[PDB]
């Protein structure tokens, strides 16, 4: 494939499927999630959408990821402090977990933000493409598995209000990736990247998976 | 008093009440209110915080505002956008209404924020202490009288996240109003803004219930 986006797309078709298989995310797809499962998967999200935000914002000027640079209609920090507050009460920012593989994750979005821009790119992609293609399908899954009161929070990280289309952002956001102007190199070191995003999710889940059977 | 938390709160007192008087605002207390009535509301909050927030990010780092400047702790248009998305769809932003006591209240705070940003302060401490403070309670009725699906979005706005203790939080911001620095004529507009903010709510309600009862 030519096109950065479809070299993405089909250089990291093997790992998707592999943290679709996990067991984790096979337990949720066939709505086997609990609120405790639940709770641990939203902490995770938080402690990675901040780091992965705080280096964008440390990036959107360069030219390695201007292009893509979407605060307004992709940011999740807020929207994970709103739900967060709501799963785990007022001092969640005191008792949220933070577990080994969360910060794993954590420090490779650190290192690339901070010593390999050009990468970020790749896990920006991984993480609000992803979190926006099977957002609708896990968020059904999670309320009815979850049975939720009806305090009108807890799940806003599953809705991007400043986007009207997501298969039409979708296809802008395709594009931009392709305007990135990088050495064959590069563009190799980020499809890699992109397969490290995975496997840091993989783990993740792993984890998880083994923190809840106790 | 001498202290500006305490002559802000002396000072507003009556327009406070009048403004808890309101019809609409009085049966919103009554647990009475449609999600039509709601609708509103939320569309009202949304442009004053969309206004309030512009002009206090255009004057943070002047010394009439940064004392009191608590972006994390107190933001509220991303909790409303998602709010709106659930309350409104996807396309929100093109449909909400955008009616003429919305326009005065959001045109006052442009203009305070771009001519005497000295008198931001005054709508900061309106808006957000009084948002904050009760908050928790209209949350309840809402809750009570909307029967929300169980799908955990459409009331983020009655949950400040980063904000543990109100009760704590409260007691810092006045003291960081108190450290203002002001003559005594400007200390004089601030407390008049304050009223001046207070009938602009109160102005706000009486059209949202001609609006819904005609």
Redesign the interface.
Known sequence: PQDLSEALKEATKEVHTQAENAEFMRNFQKGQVTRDGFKLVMASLYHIYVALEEEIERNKESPVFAPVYFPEEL?RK??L??????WYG?????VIPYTPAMQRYVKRLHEVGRTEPELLVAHAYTRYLGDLSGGQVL?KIA?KAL??????????FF???????ATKFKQLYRSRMNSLEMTPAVRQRVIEEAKTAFLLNIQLFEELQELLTH
């Open positions: 940011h807020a929207a402090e709103q739900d967060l507050a709501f007022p001092r969640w920012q005191e968020k309320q049975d939720l009161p009806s305090s009108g929070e807890g799940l806003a809705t991007f209000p400043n986007i009207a289309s």
